[PDB]
Design a protein around this ligand. Structure first.
Ligand SMILES: O=C(O)CN(CC(=O)O)CC(=O)O
Ligand SMILES: [Fe+3]
Length: 329
């Protein structure tokens, strides 16, 4: 059919899509918006030929490429801060300059994480240490990864932990709320202030966190590299634990792919970052309300680039990211 069914997951998203539909109705390939409840119902619908495309972040792209769905990324967002590359950010392990331990000596240290279940603060560092054999965890009937992590760090602040009391021990706040998901130490900046205040030896955050929170104090900090070195905060490209890819549009591997990309390439041409139209494919940025943010594509995206036909989800996400999330399941 020369109809692309975009899958949407909220009513403001569903609205943006019907506006792009009105705006492209007289093009030969047309748009039609399907709304489902969650992104997972959208993966099942694309898989079952009920819809054809949706933009997913990296963990959701992992999910969409596994059996039985087997969707692959076909185009990916580009952002200003990562300069032509299909990368959202790099996960790094920030330490104070002058401590001497390397990644070989992490056992028994205290740590700061953004929260339980988050990419840079929990899924990438802990799946990397499990994959490399530093943390032993064989699977959920063992129990939670919280127990395995508690035999590795001596105490931590992990916002959102519920199984192990040591995982909340380094957290700031009164007893009732120090380990809540919205604690004083949650998020990228929270896990950095945990490191700054000496409550942990390592903060698992992203490559921009020190520059955002402490621009004027970068050289008090270093990065812990997976090869044994410690490098400057600005050396994240050669000293990160994993690259977290850009959001990608996933689709069934079948020849409707050139049609989706043909639709997207004209849509971007007319309504991309430099459009004089009122409809913007990408944002613009500055929507304060979460329900109004990043509808269809990220508001910060500046274009979409076609993913080579031979990259599947593993190749798109990269080995470090992939083998770390694979270890968390
Ligand atoms: O990525 C996530 O899963 C959630 N975040 C926030 C975000 O990325 O905006 C923190 C983290 O990565 O620890
Ligand atoms: Fe994140």
């Amino acid at each position: 059919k020369s109809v692309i069914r975009w899958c949407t997951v909220s009513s403001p998203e569903e609205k943006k899509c019907n506006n792009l539909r009105d705006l492209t109705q007289q093009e030969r390939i047309s748009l039609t918006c399907v709304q489902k409840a969650t992104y997972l119902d959208c993966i099942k619908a694309i898989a079952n030929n009920e819809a054809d495309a949706i933009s997913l972040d990296g963990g959701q792209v992992f999910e969409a490429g596994l059996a039985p769905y087997k969707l692959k990324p076909i185009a990916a967002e580009v952002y200003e801060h990562t300069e032509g590359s299909t990368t959202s950010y790099y996960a790094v392990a920030v330490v104070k300059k002058g401590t001497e331990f390397t990644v070989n000596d992490l056992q028994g240290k205290t740590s700061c994480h953004t929260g339980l279940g988050r990419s840079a603060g929990w899924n990438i560092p802990i799946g990397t240490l499990i994959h490399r054999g530093a943390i032993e965890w064989e699977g959920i009937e063992s129990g939670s990864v919280e127990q395995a992590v508690a035999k590795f760090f001596s105490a931590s602040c992990v916002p959102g932990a519920t199984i192990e009391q040591k995982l909340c021990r380094q957290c700031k706040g009164d007893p009732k709320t120090k380990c809540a998901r919205n604690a004083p130490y949650s998020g990228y900046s929270g896990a950095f202030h945990c490191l700054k205040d000496g409550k942990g030896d390592v903060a698992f955050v992203k490559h921009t966190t020190v520059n955002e929170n402490a621009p004027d104090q970068k050289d008090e900090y270093e990065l812990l590299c997976l090869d044994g070195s410690r490098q400057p905060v600005d050396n994240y490209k050669t000293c990160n634990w994993a690259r977290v890819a850009a959001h990608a549009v996933v689709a069934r591997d079948d020849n409707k792919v050139e049609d989706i990309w043909s639709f997207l390439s004209k849509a971007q041409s007319d309504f991309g970052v430099d459009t004089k139209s009122d409809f913007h494919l990408f944002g613009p940025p500055g929507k304060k309300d979460p329900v109004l943010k990043d509808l269809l594509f990220k508001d910060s995206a500046i274009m979409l680039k076609r993913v080579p036909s031979l990259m599947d989800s593993q190749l798109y996400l990269g080995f470090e990211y992939y083998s770390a999330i694979q270890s968390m399941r």
